[PDB]
């Protein structure tokens, strides 16, 4: 048949979710580099890189395997270059560094880029597993979003703050059982790894080497190496949520090592999700779940597989919806509390600044409900924007790209004038938002994105030369064309003075 949820595994999804909340509430109501490296993996192990990485390898080939070198070229850069600067100066948080190297105005111009990047990303951490819960249950797609949003805004009652190791080992601990449920049963349903790796070659899904040296193609070897490094350096080098847990480590050699331990963990989640993408093709190289036996979104290709493969095993398809949901309760509550304490630290200095602690403790939970509405409101926007991995790396590239340019202009260039960086940032943020929205309004043609076949069978003038030659830029180049503008513009204005 097809297989769906039963009454017995529904509690398995709810029971594994509440115990993760039970670990968090006990240590709240109560760094030696091995915990914080696993806590650095749990931020990577979101519902974007579990639900959407197989559905993207299944459609656009396994060129995504070249990211295993991209994950190596970012942890080399983010440990040699960006790590000894934020550590040896005794920095508390990486946006306080910007008023040390430049004036205080660019820090308020810096964290406003962080807020628009965060609320655009945390709408994709929320909407993606709600796009999975709508598939397995048919609940509703717009109601499961506001279901997920209100349980994290009420988790801002000092439960989401003070992140513990024990609520982060459970994220991987379910996810090491979530993939091993779906990898192992897919091999025995298809008869060997050498059968999964045989129909994928006949479908053209291998696709490991492209080497085409033009930026207009979406996935090359050069886009993933050059442009993909500049995207992920904006996450592991300058993003405040992933530098706060580098300074908090005690020894400088250990904090460097924590960035080198999760490189194994990033290589694990990439290999265990690319191989789910090749498993997802060999199961459906006759009747895809698109075009027939439909799933609304492309990101409903992993939860459609799980109820198709684990239908005769009760208990286990609730575990796959659990590990998609397990990442969000740690991410979004920390995502909101990162937006909470930074905003009230930003707000008090142009305010009256002499209010009492009763209003300040009120406004810490005053804006936390406001941002959760902006978390929900941007999650309704994320029903657009497409593939939800292409959109999760664009809003890292098109917004957080030029933000990485300031730290490149500050650290490397010794003569960065502060009036040069402020007009350098807003020039770079304008070029990236020009190409970043131009691609998401007019998508690239399929001769540049190269999507693969889907095989519906065996189931028993418009273009203008700006829209074609620059809006078809690769989505991993929205930070290269952002950083290499605010480094060029940021120097020549500084060179003018």
């Amino acid at each position: 048949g097809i297989g769906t949820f039963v009454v017995w595994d529904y509690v398995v999804f709810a029971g594994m979710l509440v115990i993760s909340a039970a670990i968090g509430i006990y240590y709240a109501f109560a760094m030696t580099a091995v915990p914080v490296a696993l806590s650095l993996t749990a931020s990577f192990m979101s519902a974007v890189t579990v639900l959407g990485t197989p559905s993207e390898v299944y459609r656009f080939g396994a060129i995504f395997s070249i990211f295993a070198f991209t994950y190596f070229f970012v942890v080399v850069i983010s440990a040699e270059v960006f790590l000894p600067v934020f550590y040896k100066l005794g920095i508390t948080s990486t946006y306080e560094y910007l008023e040390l190297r430049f004036n205080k105005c660019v820090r308020l111009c810096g964290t406003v880029l962080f807020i628009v990047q965060t609320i655009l990303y945390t709408g994709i951490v929320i909407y993606a597993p709600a796009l999975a819960l709508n598939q397995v249950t048919g609940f509703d797609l717009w109601g499961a979003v506001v279901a997920t949003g209100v349980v994290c805004t009420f988790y801002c009652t000092l439960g989401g703050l003070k992140a513990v190791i024990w609520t982060d080992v459970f994220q991987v601990g379910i996810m090491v059982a979530g993939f091993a449920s779906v990898i192992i049963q897919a091999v025995v349903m298809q008869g060997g790894i050498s059968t999964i790796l045989n129909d994928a070659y006949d479908g053209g899904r291998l696709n490991f080497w492209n080497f085409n040296p033009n930026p207009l193609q979406r996935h090359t070897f050069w886009t993933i190496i050059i442009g993909g490094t500049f995207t992920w350096t904006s996450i592991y080098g300058v993003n405040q949520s992933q530098v706060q847990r580098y300074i908090s480590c005690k020894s400088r050699f250990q904090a460097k090592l924590s960035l080198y331990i999760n490189l194994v963990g990033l290589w694990a989640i990439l290999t265990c999700s690319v191989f789910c993408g090749l498993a997802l093709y060999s199961r459906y190289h006759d009747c895809d779940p698109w075009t027939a036996k439909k799933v609304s979104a492309p990101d409903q290709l992993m939860p459609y597989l799980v109820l198709d493969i684990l239908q005769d095993y009760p208990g286990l398809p609730g575990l796959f919806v659990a590990c998609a949901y397990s990442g969000t309760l740690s991410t979004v509550s920390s995502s909101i509390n990162a937006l909470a304490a930074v905003t009230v630290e930003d707000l008090i200095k142009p305010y009256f600044r002499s209010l009492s602690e009763r209003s300040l403790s009120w406004i810490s939970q005053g804006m936390s409900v406001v941002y959760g509405a902006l978390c929900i409101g941007m999650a309704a926007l994320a029903s657009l924007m497409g593939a939800l991995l292409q959109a999760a790396l664009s809003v890292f590239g098109m917004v957080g790209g030029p933000l990485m340019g300031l730290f490149a202009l500050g650290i490397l260039v010794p003569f960065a004038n502060s009036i040069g960086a402020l007009v350098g940032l807003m020039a770079g943020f304008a070029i990236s938002l020009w190409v970043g929205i131009g691609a998401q309004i007019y998508p690239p043609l399929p001769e540049r994105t190269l999507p693969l076949h889907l095989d519906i069978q065996g189931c028993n003038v418009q273009r203008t030369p700006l829209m074609d030659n620059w809006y078809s830029l690769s989505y991993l180049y929205f930070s290269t064309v952002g950083t290499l503008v605010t480094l060029l513009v940021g120097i020549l204005v500084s060179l003018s003075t």
Partner: nanobody
Amino acid sequence: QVQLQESGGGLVQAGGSLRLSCAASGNISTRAGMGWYRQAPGKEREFVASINWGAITNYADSVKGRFTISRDNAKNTVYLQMNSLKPEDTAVYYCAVEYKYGPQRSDTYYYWGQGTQVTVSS
């Protein structure tokens, strides 16, 4: 990406026979639905002769019966074969492979190969 090539075409007698071959290198999907388009001088991209993985063979109304086409899935190639060559059906011929990548109707792209000119005499 697929970088496909072709051969088998040139000057023949008007009324004879010919077999046009077309290989397909790269990481081309086998269950693809390769086809055969042509372009007359000064005209538009002309008919499709599509053959899918299930060998459901299609023709245009001008070329029913007189032309035939068959593929084999072992080497990913297609053979377009000619009979009853008219004095005016001469054109350049392209070897397309119609990918389908989505649920809608207007989402297909073609991977056009290089041309091959076939001419007649009388």
